[PDB]
Amino acid sequence: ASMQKLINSVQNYAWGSKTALTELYGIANPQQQPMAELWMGAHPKSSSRITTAGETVSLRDAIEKNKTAMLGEAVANRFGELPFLFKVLCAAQPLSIQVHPNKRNSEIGFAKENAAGIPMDAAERNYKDPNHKPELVFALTPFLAMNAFREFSDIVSLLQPVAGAHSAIAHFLQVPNAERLSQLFASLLNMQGEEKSRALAVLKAALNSQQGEPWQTIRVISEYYPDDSGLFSPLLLNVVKLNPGEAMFLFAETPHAYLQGVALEVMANSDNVLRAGLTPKYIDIPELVANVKFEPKPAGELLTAPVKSGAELDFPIPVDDFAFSLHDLALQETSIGQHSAAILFCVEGEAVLRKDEQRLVLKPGESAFIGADESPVNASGTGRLARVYNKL
């Protein structure tokens, strides 16, 4: 069929919302499982599925038999597969701080782990691609997060109340530069026993005499990671609240975290992750440090600025891998065309999609796959349609 309603995986990771997807989209959850992620794509560990005409088949399997017709010649020749995973994330808990290594260091890490024969899907495994994979997050409900290091004077101002927590903090305050920020970071991560509890106790005292942000975020996080050096991170990293509709592109070598809410996320199937706190897992600190750019990002540069053309709101991404756009539906049809495969996801309202004689309804939280050889489709309705595709 021209258009293909997707049967999508729900990953029930422990940190998921028992309710969000049900509330938002009317997805059934009788057993009240935590629903962390809704997957839309062709990931080899849990592909989306389509219905033959009336049996269900893997979308990954269907692409593989029909690569050029389904992906477009461009995508088939650049990547050889669907180059994106599209997700709905429901953080009912705050998640680990993460860094994605750059291209050079990803190749090395990918090769190091492969030389040691670590299976691609082991917990030990941190590098699943030789490349640096980009990542876009797009807020569906108010979405709390950290992203990148704050401006140095901003960090100074935030550390003053906790100056006595660790000498590495005092060191930074004296000369607040990139180098000492690096030593401060590593030092917090490596605190042990009574050194760590000493620093935690200073921070806790502070929480009792400081108001608003990012103190309030630390208070929230501490309910889940009360014994984590990561509690110091909102003093170092930018605490952002995305409103519905806003987006952030996550650069390499830049610590970030998802703390609360529901969001769309676009990524590769395979990425590389170094953990930088808010985790019980062991961290290789020198490696982490070697993969971090200790460079402030001013607040005004956090959100990717969309570009509106007609009914199309594009979110420009400095990568060839995937593109992201939001389409305002109206009752009069507009044309949604691309040179590649595309996944269409109704954000809100309701979409009618038309292809010649075929028509297909998406209520909020539902998605269809459009093979390259089937563009364009006509869309009408109310609310908003989200599209992941490829511009090449």
Which residues are known binding-site members for Zn(2+)? 98, 100, 135, 256
Closest CA to 271 of 157, 92, 35, 110: 110
Whether residue 198 lies in the annotated active site: no
How big is the site for Zn ion, counted in residues (CB under 5 A)? 2
Dihedral over alpha carbons 59, 85, 10, 54 (to 10 degrees): -20
User: Interaction with Zn ion in 362-391: which residues (CB under 5 A)?
Assistant: none
Question: Which lies closer to Zn ion via its Cβ, residue 60 or residue 100?
Answer: 100
Measured CA distances, 116 to 101, 120, 132 (Å): 19, 11, 21
Q: What is the spatial distance between Cα 283 and Cα 302, in angstroms, rounded to a whole number?
A: 26
User: Interaction with Zn ion in 113-152: which residues (CB under 5 A)?
Assistant: 135
User: Interaction with Zn ion in 187-216: which residues (CB under 5 A)?
Assistant: none
Q: How far is the CB of 135 from Zn ion (least distance, A)?
A: 5
Q: How far is the CB of 343 from Zn ion (least distance, A)?
A: 20
Options 47-55, 94-102, 164-172, 213-221: segment touching Zn ion (CB under 5 A):
94-102
Q: How far is the CB of 147 from Zn ion (least distance, A)?
A: 10
Question: Which lies closer to Zn ion via its Cβ, residue 275 or residue 327?
Answer: 275
Element (H, E) at 168: helix 167-174
Question: Which lies closer to Zn ion via its Cβ, residue 9 or residue 272?
Answer: 272
Instruction: Please check whether residue 365 is in contact with residue 381, taking contact to mean a CB–CB distance below 8 angstroms.
Output: no
What the block records as the tokens of 180 is 């000492």
Q: How far is the CB of 231 from Zn ion (least distance, A)?
A: 20
Question: Which lies closer to Zn ion via its Cβ, residue 173 or residue 302?
Answer: 302
Question: Which lies closer to Zn ion via its Cβ, residue 205 or residue 289?
Answer: 289
Near Zn ion by CB under 5 A: residue from 98, 105, 126, 229: 98
Binding residues are 98, 100, 135, 256
Q: What is the spatial distance between Cα 335 and Cα 379, in angstroms, rounded to a whole number?
A: 6
The residue whose two tokens read 């901003």 is 154
Provide the CB-side half-sphere exposure for 322 (13 A, CA).
26
Q: How far is the CB of 98 from Zn ion (least distance, A)?
A: 5
23-32 long-range contacts (CB < 8 A, ≥24 apart) are 24/140, 24/141, 24/262, 24/364, 24/365, 25/363, 25/364, 25/365, 25/366, 26/363, 26/364, 26/365, 27/365
Instruction: Please check whether residue 20 is in contact with residue 92, taking contact to mean a CB–CB distance below 8 angstroms.
Output: yes
Say which of 180, 275, 384, 387 is annotated catalytic.
275
> Under the rule (CB under 5 A), what is the footprint of Zn ion?
98, 135
Would you name the residues annotated as active-site residues?
Answer: 275
